[PDB]
């Protein structure tokens, strides 16, 4: 029998986030341990809730109710194997009282919680991970947290506590030994005492970010303490912090660094200090000798305010940093990179990552970079190199954690990345004495030149290159045919030159490339070439050609582009998303390569689609036409296709599936009908002639009619359990209006 | 009655375009003598289609069947008051036969006839304007046009002829001596003799572009003449066009220009000679001193391929050229302008415009321009300045809009230097110039902090366009040297706004004393630096989509609460696209007072608080379009007088309350299309009040068609002077039977 309305999986899950449900289902699985019911509409927690699931282990609440959540006493403390739970964003009022004993994990990040009680927390001795965070915070109407004294104290068990975002002003005391991590970013504490952290000698990480912090250009309501002052924190804050190995001082207000503050922590391998105001301390730096571990340091956005330093001024203590392994340096703010300046970077044998972002730097000695031991990143974007809540809870509040350059660009190897600078002309000598870069990003330069195949020599082994979002004047059959080894070429949004109809238009330099992969030529604007109208290669197997106006090259009066694309013999995977199409003309597509796996026609206007020419297409596994204004399939799929596994069609006018539909198809695997105005599926439709291969139906956003109509489907639904339809709770009655809103499979 | 499926009015006109439907209504008011039906699927025509309607002046049948129609001879021969009929894109084989003789105007353009014939169009002796334009053209499946000999000559008050885009290899003999405008584009014609326009003294439009056409580059199929030979046009063959006003000679692949062409062609005012070969005309051109009342020269792209040359070569001759109001020299090509090269246009007393555009220029001597007696526009556009797809109907060669947009060139001289490499304006960049009062520096990728230096040269912009570049509004006192700032466009300067570490500077706003309009769109705004407010005493509109108002107006900062209260005198406010799930209460009403217009469409928008509207005595228009709101109130007249259009399109209202329509006797427009409803209720219709609603939008919605729908129709009936839009577009969603037809045919 089909679970309603959670989708249960194995992996026993019952995921039943975003179901409209307005309170816990008595529809659940038996076999059921973890049961997710975020983002729905609960209001009401009882003892009753959970009856028949004495077996759950995990339970997710958060955000309930969706855009405020009672929870009577006891609620939870029948379930015996009850391990997470997770009322987060419930703008809860008060710890639940009476929760499980059986509970090693509790967040109750984002509510309204300004009392932590014994009564609500310390009888819950097995719990490991317990998150307060995020309950008083900005310019929330919220109250102090009062943490009732000794609280903690019985957790004996514990070992990570977040604390953050709410307002102690002292850190409590009376922690248990066990913690491991402990969390207690802004939360007003402006002073660090000999005696907050005497017991926690087990402690990996600890996190004071926010604590008198810097408040200047900040983007979100801050309140720095008097006088801007640091944070005061003495000088044996840490002297039992020997296992540290995480260390979060952003936004402390710091101009100095106490070196004895490392004294004791031989392991310590990140250090966070961003949001300081440290540049003295990053041109003298005693404490840099303490940390011969450590392999992170972020000292980004330590510059002083109104100010242009020409150099960056980096202590020749960072020569004794011989663990270091990344350093990032963004809005420092300074105007030139000299070799000089980072002499003592250039011994660290492991320094594989710089990153220089927004720093307003000017001018680049680049042959610096060479002089280092082991770079892989060199990350400079964003400079001016010439030739319900907005904060995640659970993400870093200082900085994006996403990775500096693309893993698929970085793979390759070496990366330099001078994106959003403004390198508009690439001269004879700008990559001179680089080290081997194979990963190359200049998206955004506003570069306009003419690529004439000599401007890349310096650096021949580029293998991914990103020249997205210029505006390149591609008007010269040689361009980038330096680079033989290019792999992934990227010139989406070059739009500027390529609009001009007046202007002449080169792309024959695409057939050069002998292990060329992957172009992407997305909106370009593209509808019309100079001379060669046809792209080749023997090698491409993706081309992304979305966002230009195939609409325009394929018109009806014009044969010129009739064979575009026919030329990439090796092509697999093709996107012609987003190019106005009403229409394809049948010896348009049949010019296609033959070789295609993969068709993306999705987001044009298509309301014309000749399904006879897929027998031109026998590898052809995946049809992607969404989003266009489709009114007819075909009812002979199989006798056009014995390839095609994936058909998406949803966001279509389908009105109809015809007779002898399912059965026909045989091949597909995944039917995607969603959004689109079916009203029925009739019997002929389902028929059952031979056995289908199909493992996924979707039909949610369908206008389905609930009457003696829909009997025949529902019947279907039953009886083909190994066709999974997403989102039955989406499957819903448009009509009689009595039923309107109703899911069909509730009938 | 309530007008179906056609709206009428009275400029007596029905409009009954692009309605879906099978054939000509019926259905047409008895006064109607105009009548539109285009882009419909109509498929058939006879003498019965138009029985009712026998006073019809006008019938516009093109784009039928909107992607053949077939007319019976002598469909329309009942109709003696029919002057005009259209029928373009109909795909038809022939010249419909049987045509009326009362026709002064008709149009087959876009179709498939290759054989103009007498039978067609000789009788039609009443013809004034004849178009048979685009019937074979680039690479459409075709035949040969052939126009019978003699076909026109019957046609004594033709005024105006068409035969362009279509393959004629000559001009047709024996036409009219009446005609004023012959249009021959792109036909195939290599040759012009001494007889094809011998009789045609009245003429005043000559188009024979695209003869012997220039292919290089082309943006369509293009076959140009052997060897791509010019056009050959004998010295006499305009001997006798004394009338002649314009003559398109743009793509004849011309070299040399026949100066004697001229001769007896003293009224020629605009002459247009785009995508030739004519860079040695332009550097000596004895033609030039034939041309003395000539006010339009447009000689853009006759660029040497593969050339770039260092300077353009303007001959002395364009001095003698003293009527020149506009000359227009794109795609020219040449790598630097210099004071000299321009000097035979400086003494021209009424040159206007220049056109530069798309020349590569990398340097201009702008104080040039200082030296023309009366320049006004100053088009450099697309430059490298540093520190069927066409419509038949428009012009082939170039787009006819204004150069700059007529908003900023109505405040005076006008200097476009958008789409270049201005990334950087130094001290001097704009000294020497003329008075500036519109200036386009849109597109320059200008990544600079202005800082009140900058415009120092041009200290009178009335109208400034910075668009689109990556500008670093990092000082107070930025552009605050233009005193006289009007207009303020700094839309799509998003590069640094969306950087949240780097400070952002927005104070300057409230320096300028009779600054308008501004338009801070699409800068992902989110956070400002020390100031949070916006202030102007001056200010009427300020566009701020595309912004981030979601975070700037987040529910645990109070900081941006009053971002637009500073702008006292607003009364126009664009809020669109600011991805708003919803506005605090405290926010909304801290927007400013004077507001008379609100938009806040294609937000999230699940909930608005209509009792807010209270603090908004002057608020006109409401524009809530695009969102998701489920609730409207049931009391909108306790809380507003002055509101007269409300726009609430594309929501998710599913049910409208028992007093709403009542309510408010201060709505004139309420649309309600694309909106969830199902029916609408006797109770939510009147109260019978003073009610002014005259507009009521409600197609899109998934009517039932039951009898529940059956209230709404009687109330339509007995309510006409409420006007409801595409009436064909008000459907039943259901029941099955009943879907996709009109609710108003059930
Ligand atoms: C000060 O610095 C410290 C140390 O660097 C830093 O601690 C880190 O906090 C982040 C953010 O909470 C932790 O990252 C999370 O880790 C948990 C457990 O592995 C994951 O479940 C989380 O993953 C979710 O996060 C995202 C939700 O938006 C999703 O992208 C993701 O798919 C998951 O859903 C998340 O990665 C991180 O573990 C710690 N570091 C350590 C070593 O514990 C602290 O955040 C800094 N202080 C501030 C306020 O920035
Ligand atoms: C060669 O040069 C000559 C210049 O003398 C040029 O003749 C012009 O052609 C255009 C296009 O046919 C004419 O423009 C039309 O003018 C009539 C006025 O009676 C209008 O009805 C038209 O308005 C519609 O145009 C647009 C439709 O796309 C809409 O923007 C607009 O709202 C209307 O719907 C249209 O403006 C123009 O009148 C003549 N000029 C003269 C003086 O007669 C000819 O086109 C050139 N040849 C080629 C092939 O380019
Ligand atoms: C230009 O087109 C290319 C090619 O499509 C884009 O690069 C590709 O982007 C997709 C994401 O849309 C990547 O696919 C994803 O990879 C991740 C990581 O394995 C995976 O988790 C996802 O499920 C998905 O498979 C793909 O790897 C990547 N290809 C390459 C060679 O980088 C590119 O982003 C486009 N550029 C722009 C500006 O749109
Ligand atoms: C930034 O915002 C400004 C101000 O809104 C935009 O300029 C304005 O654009 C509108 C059209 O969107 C113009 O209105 C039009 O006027 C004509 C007749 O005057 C009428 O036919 C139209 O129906 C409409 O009313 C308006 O005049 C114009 N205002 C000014 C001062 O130019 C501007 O386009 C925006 N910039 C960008 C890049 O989006
Ligand atoms: C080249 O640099 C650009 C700019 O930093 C990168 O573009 C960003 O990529 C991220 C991650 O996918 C997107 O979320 C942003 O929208 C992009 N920024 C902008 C302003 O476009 C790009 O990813 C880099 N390329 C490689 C290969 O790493
Ligand atoms: C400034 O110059 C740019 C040059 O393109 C003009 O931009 C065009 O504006 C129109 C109307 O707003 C748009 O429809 C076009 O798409 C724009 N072109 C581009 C490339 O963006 C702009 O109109 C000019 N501003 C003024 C005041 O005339
Ligand atoms: C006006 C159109 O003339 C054809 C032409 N196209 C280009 C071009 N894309 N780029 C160019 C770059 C430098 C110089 C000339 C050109 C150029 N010329
Ligand atoms: C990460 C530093 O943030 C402070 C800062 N913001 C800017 C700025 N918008 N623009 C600038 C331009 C030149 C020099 C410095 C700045 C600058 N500095
Ligand atoms: C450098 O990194 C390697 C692992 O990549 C490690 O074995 C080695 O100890 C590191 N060297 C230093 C000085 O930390
Ligand atoms: C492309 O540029 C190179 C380098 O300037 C030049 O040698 C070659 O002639 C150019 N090719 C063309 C113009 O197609
Ligand atoms: C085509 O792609 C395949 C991998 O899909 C690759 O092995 C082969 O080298 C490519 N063909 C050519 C001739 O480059
Ligand atoms: C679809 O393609 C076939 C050839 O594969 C062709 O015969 C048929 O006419 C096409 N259908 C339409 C209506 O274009
Ligand atoms: C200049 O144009 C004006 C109309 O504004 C006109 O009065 C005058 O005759 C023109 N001068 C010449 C030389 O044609
Ligand atoms: C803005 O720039 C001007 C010109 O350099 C300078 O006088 C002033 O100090 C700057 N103001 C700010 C906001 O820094
Ligand atoms: C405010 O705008 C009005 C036009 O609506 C204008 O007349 C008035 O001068 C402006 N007031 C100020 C103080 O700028
Ligand atoms: C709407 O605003 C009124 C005051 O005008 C306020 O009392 C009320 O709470 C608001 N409505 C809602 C549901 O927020």
Redesign the interface.
């Given at each position: 029998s089909r679970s309603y309305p959670c989708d249960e999986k194995k992996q026993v899950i019952a995921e039943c986030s975003n179901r409209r449900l307005q309170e816990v289902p008595q529809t659940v699985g038996k076999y059921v341990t973890e049961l997710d019911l975020s983002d729905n509409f609960i209001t009401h927690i009882t003892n009753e809730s959970f009856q028949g699931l004495q077996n759950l282990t995990k339970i997710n609440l958060n955000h309930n109710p969706n855009?405020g959540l009672n929870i009577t006493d006891g609620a939870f403390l029948n379930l015996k194997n009850l391990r997470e739970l997770l009322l987060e964003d419930n703008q809860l009022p008060q710890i639940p009282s009476g929760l499980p004993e059986s509970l090693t994990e509790l967040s109750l990040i984002q509510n309204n919680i300004y009392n932590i009680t014994k009564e609500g927390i310390s009888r819950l001795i097995n719990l490991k991970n317990l998150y307060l965070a995020w309950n008083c915070?900005?310019?929330?109407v919220c109250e102090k947290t009062n943490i009732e004294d000794g609280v903690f104290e019985t957790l004996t068990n514990l070992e990570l506590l977040s604390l953050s975002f709410n307002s102690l002003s002292h850190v409590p005391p009376k922690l248990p030994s066990s913690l491991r991590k402990l969390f207690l970013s802004n939360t007003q504490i402006k002073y660090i005492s000999e005696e907050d952290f005497k017991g926690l000698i087990n402690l990996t990480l600890l996190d004071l970010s926010g604590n008198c912090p810097r408040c200047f250009?900040a983007?979100?309501?801050c309140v720095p303490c008097d006088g801007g002052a640091s944070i005061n924190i003495d000088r044996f804050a840490f002297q039992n912090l020997t296992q540290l190995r995480y260390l979060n001082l952003s936004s402390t207000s710091l101009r100095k660094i106490n070196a004895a503050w490392f004294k004791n922590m031989p392991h310590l391998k990140v250090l966070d200090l961003e949001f300081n105001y440290l540049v003295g301390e990053i041109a003298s730096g005693a404490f840099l000798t303490m940390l011969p571990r450590l392999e992170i340091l972020d000292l980004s956005?330590n510059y002083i305010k109104g100010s242009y330093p020409q150099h960056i001024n980096i202590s020749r203590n960072f020569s004794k940093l011989l663990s270091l392994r990344a350093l990032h340096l963004?809005?420092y703010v300074f105007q030139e990179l000299r070799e000089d300046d980072f002499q003592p970077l250039m011994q660290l044998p492991n320094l594989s990552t710089i990153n220089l972002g927004?720093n307003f730097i000017k001018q680049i000695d680049f042959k610096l970079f060479q002089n280092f031991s082991n770079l892989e990143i060199i990350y400079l974007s964003?400079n001016?190199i010439s030739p319900?809540?907005?904060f995640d809870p659970h993400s870093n509040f200082y900085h994006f954690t996403r990775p500096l350059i693309k893993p698929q660009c970085a793979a390759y190897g070496k990366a330099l990345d001078l994106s959003?600078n403004?390198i508009?002309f690439i001269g004879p000598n700008q990559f001179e004495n680089l080290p081997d870069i194979a990963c190359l990003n200049l998206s955004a330069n506003?570069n306009?030149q003419v690529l004439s195949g000599t401007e890349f020599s310096a650096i021949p082994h580029v293998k991914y290159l990103d020249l997205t979002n210029n505006?390149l004047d591609f008007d010269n059959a040689s361009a980038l045919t330096e680079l033989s080894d290019l792999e992934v070429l990227d010139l989406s949004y070059n739009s500027?030159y390529f609009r001009?109809?007046?202007?002449?238009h080169h792309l024959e330099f695409i057939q050069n490339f002998t292990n060329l992969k992957v172009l992407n030529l997305s909106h370009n604007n593209i509808?019309?070439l100079?001379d060669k109208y046809n792209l080749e290669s023997k090698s491409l197997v993706e081309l992304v050609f979305s966002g230009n106006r195939l609409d325009?090259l394929w018109?009806?009066?014009?044969?010129?582009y009739i064979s575009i694309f026919k030329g990439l013999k090796n092509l697999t995977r093709l996107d012609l998303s987003l190019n106005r199409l009403k229409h394809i003309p049948n010896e348009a597509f049949l010019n296609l390569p033959a070789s295609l796996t993969e068709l993306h026609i999705n987001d044009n206007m298509l309301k014309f689609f000749n399904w006879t020419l897929l027998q031109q297409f026998p590898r052809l596994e995946l049809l992607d036409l969404r989003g266009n204004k489709l009114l007819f399939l075909t009812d002979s799929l199989s006798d056009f296709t014995s390839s095609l596994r994936t058909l998406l069609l949803s966001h279509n006018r389908i009105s109809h599936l015809p007779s002898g539909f399912l059965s026909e198809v045989s091949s597909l695997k995944h039917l995607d009908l969603s959004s689109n105005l079916l009203?029925?599926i009739n019997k002929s439709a389902l028929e059952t002639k031979t056995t289908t291969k199909l493992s996924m139906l979707e039909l949610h956003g369908n206008?389905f009619?609930c009457?003696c109509?829909i009997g025949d489907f529902r019947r279907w639904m039953d009886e083909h359990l190994n066709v999974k339809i997403p989102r039955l709770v989406d499957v819903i009655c448009?009509?009689?209006?009595d039923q309107?809103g109703k899911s069909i499979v509730s009938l």
């Amino acid at each position: 029998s089909r679970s309603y309305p959670c989708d249960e999986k194995k992996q026993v899950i019952a995921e039943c986030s975003n179901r409209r449900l307005q309170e816990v289902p008595q529809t659940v699985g038996k076999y059921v341990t973890e049961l997710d019911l975020s983002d729905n509409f609960i209001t009401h927690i009882t003892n009753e809730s959970f009856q028949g699931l004495q077996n759950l282990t995990k339970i997710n609440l958060n955000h309930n109710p969706n855009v405020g959540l009672n929870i009577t006493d006891g609620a939870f403390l029948n379930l015996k194997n009850l391990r997470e739970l997770l009322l987060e964003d419930n703008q809860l009022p008060q710890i639940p009282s009476g929760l499980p004993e059986s509970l090693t994990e509790l967040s109750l990040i984002q509510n309204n919680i300004y009392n932590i009680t014994k009564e609500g927390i310390s009888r819950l001795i097995n719990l490991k991970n317990l998150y307060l965070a995020w309950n008083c915070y900005f310019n929330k109407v919220c109250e102090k947290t009062n943490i009732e004294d000794g609280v903690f104290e019985t957790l004996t068990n514990l070992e990570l506590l977040s604390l953050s975002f709410n307002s102690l002003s002292h850190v409590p005391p009376k922690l248990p030994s066990s913690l491991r991590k402990l969390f207690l970013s802004n939360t007003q504490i402006k002073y660090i005492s000999e005696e907050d952290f005497k017991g926690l000698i087990n402690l990996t990480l600890l996190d004071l970010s926010g604590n008198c912090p810097r408040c200047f250009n900040a983007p979100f309501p801050c309140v720095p303490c008097d006088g801007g002052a640091s944070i005061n924190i003495d000088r044996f804050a840490f002297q039992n912090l020997t296992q540290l190995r995480y260390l979060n001082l952003s936004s402390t207000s710091l101009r100095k660094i106490n070196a004895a503050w490392f004294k004791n922590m031989p392991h310590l391998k990140v250090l966070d200090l961003e949001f300081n105001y440290l540049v003295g301390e990053i041109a003298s730096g005693a404490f840099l000798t303490m940390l011969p571990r450590l392999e992170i340091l972020d000292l980004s956005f330590n510059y002083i305010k109104g100010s242009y330093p020409q150099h960056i001024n980096i202590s020749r203590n960072f020569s004794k940093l011989l663990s270091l392994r990344a350093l990032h340096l963004r809005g420092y703010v300074f105007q030139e990179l000299r070799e000089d300046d980072f002499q003592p970077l250039m011994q660290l044998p492991n320094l594989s990552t710089i990153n220089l972002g927004i720093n307003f730097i000017k001018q680049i000695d680049f042959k610096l970079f060479q002089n280092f031991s082991n770079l892989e990143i060199i990350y400079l974007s964003e400079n001016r190199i010439s030739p319900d809540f907005e904060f995640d809870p659970h993400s870093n509040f200082y900085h994006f954690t996403r990775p500096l350059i693309k893993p698929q660009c970085a793979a390759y190897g070496k990366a330099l990345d001078l994106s959003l600078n403004s390198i508009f002309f690439i001269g004879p000598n700008q990559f001179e004495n680089l080290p081997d870069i194979a990963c190359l990003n200049l998206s955004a330069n506003s570069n306009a030149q003419v690529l004439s195949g000599t401007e890349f020599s310096a650096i021949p082994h580029v293998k991914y290159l990103d020249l997205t979002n210029n505006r390149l004047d591609f008007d010269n059959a040689s361009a980038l045919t330096e680079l033989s080894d290019l792999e992934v070429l990227d010139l989406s949004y070059n739009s500027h030159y390529f609009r001009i109809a007046g202007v002449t238009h080169h792309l024959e330099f695409i057939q050069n490339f002998t292990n060329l992969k992957v172009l992407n030529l997305s909106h370009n604007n593209i509808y019309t070439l100079t001379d060669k109208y046809n792209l080749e290669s023997k090698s491409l197997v993706e081309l992304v050609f979305s966002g230009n106006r195939l609409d325009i090259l394929w018109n009806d009066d014009d044969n010129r582009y009739i064979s575009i694309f026919k030329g990439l013999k090796n092509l697999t995977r093709l996107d012609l998303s987003l190019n106005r199409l009403k229409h394809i003309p049948n010896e348009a597509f049949l010019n296609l390569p033959a070789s295609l796996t993969e068709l993306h026609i999705n987001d044009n206007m298509l309301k014309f689609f000749n399904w006879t020419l897929l027998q031109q297409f026998p590898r052809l596994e995946l049809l992607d036409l969404r989003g266009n204004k489709l009114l007819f399939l075909t009812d002979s799929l199989s006798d056009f296709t014995s390839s095609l596994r994936t058909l998406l069609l949803s966001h279509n006018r389908i009105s109809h599936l015809p007779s002898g539909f399912l059965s026909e198809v045989s091949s597909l695997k995944h039917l995607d009908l969603s959004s689109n105005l079916l009203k029925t599926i009739n019997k002929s439709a389902l028929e059952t002639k031979t056995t289908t291969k199909l493992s996924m139906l979707e039909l949610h956003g369908n206008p389905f009619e609930c009457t003696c109509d829909i009997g025949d489907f529902r019947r279907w639904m039953d009886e083909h359990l190994n066709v999974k339809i997403p989102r039955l709770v989406d499957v819903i009655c448009a009509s009689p209006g009595d039923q309107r809103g109703k899911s069909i499979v509730s009938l």
